[PDB]
């Protein structure tokens, strides 16, 4: 599923990302935009053998288990397949655990390169929430 900007903003708010551990809602919508372009089925094979999964491109070397990644740690205790659903529940649960580490949202390269330091609030402006 490909979410509309405002559609995802409302969904993420319902899933409790509107100000979660210091991160405003705009950060999460902006992250999804540049990580997966709002596509829940997005996958990206990496050079180290890992793969990034879903709307928030969660990695299989550190966060989820896809059974094909060397050195997998499965920090989110969840199969990567659960992160490739139109239902963002699992991705949000894992994203919350990821951001509960001192590294915060820096775990998301796209967010770091295209969102951090920008007017992230603009990503939820003009939306019925």
């Amino acid at each position, epitope marked *: 599923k490909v979410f509309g900007r405002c559609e995802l903003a409302a969904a993420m708010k319902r899933h409790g990302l509107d100000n*979660y551990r210091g991160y405003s809602l705009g950060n999460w919508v902006c992250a999804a935009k540049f990580e997966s372009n709002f596509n829940t089925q997005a996958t990206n094979r990496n050079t180290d053998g890992s793969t990034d999964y879903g709307i928030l491109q969660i990695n299989s070397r550190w966060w989820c288990n896809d059974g094909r990644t060397p050195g997998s*740690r499965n*920090l989110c205790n969840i199969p990567c397949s659960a992160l490739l659903s139109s239902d963002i529940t699992a991705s949000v649960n894992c994203a919350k*655990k990821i951001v509960s580490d001192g590294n915060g949202m820096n775990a998301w390269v796209a967010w770091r390169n295209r969102c951090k330091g920008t007017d992230v609030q603009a990503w939820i402006r003009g939306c019925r929430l």
Partner: antibody, heavy 113, light 107 residues
Framework: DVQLQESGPSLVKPSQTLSLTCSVT????????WSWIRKFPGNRLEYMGY???????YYNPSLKSRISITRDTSKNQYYLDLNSVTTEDTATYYC???????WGQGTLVTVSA | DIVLTQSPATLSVTPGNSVSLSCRAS??????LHWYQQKSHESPRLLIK???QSISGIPSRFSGSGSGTDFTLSINSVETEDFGMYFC?????????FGGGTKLEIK
């Protein structure tokens, strides 16, 4: 499957350092975030803190910098050190993973002169 | 810090009847409210996470609801094994905090 178990002194003196160990079996300590929670004699629960994968720690401000949570991957254990304890620190201490699915059996620690 | 207030402090019920337990946060915590059960001489057991998400291995009779500041844990047809303490816990902001607990007893 995963198993957690607390170990350490059950009786300590005021002003000393209370130290507990949580042994993890079934999976690596590098595969989760680890926490310490305690229950005071009056049924009050307090989340003491946790250590995440990067090594970053989060401690409850109520502990006024008296707490330290560390890890030892080689022994697959993590620890709780609480300095300058008082009678107010008498409680049942539990270790559990951040998700809350795995908990130790809990161990009572009494602080008395 | 976020203060969680649970009510009632104690609830008596006869097995077979249903009950609902309340937990209110001093400020909005979205859906970051979890429910735990705790019996004498035992570690807490996670029943519901993120307000209403089910947990594998927990009886189906347990359900959670709510968002923002008002949450509820419902038990459809209480069983004797359900008697004990129930605590809510928020993880929206650090430090994580627990409610004062609600004791469920046989009536």
């Amino acid at each position: 499957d995963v198993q957690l178990q607390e170990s350490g002194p059950s009786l300590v003196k005021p002003s000393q350092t209370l130290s507990l160990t949580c042994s993890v079996t079934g999976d690596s300590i590098t595969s989760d975030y680890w926490s310490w929670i305690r229950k005071f004699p009056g049924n009050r629960l307090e989340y003491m803190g946790y250590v995440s994968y990067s090594g970053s720690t989060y401690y409850n401000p109520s502990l006024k910098s008296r707490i330290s949570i560390t890890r030892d991957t080689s022994k697959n254990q993590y620890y709780l050190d609480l300095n300058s304890v008082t009678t107010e620190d008498t409680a049942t201490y539990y270790c559990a993973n951040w998700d809350g699915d795995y908990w130790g059996q809990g161990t009572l620690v009494t602080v008395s002169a | 810090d976020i203060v969680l207030t649970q009510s009632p402090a104690t609830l008596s019920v006869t097995p077979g009847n249903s009950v609902s337990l309340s937990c209110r946060a001093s400020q909005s915590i979205g859906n970051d409210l979890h429910w735990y059960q705790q019996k004498s001489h035992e570690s807490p057991r996670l029943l519901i996470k993120y307000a209403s998400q089910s947990i594998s291995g927990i009886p189906s009779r347990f359900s959670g609801s709510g968002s923002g500041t008002d949450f509820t844990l419902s038990i459809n047809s209480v069983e004797t094994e359900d008697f004990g303490m129930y605590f809510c816990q928020q993880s929206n902001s650090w430090p994580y905090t627990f409610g004062g607990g609600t004791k469920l007893e046989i009536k």
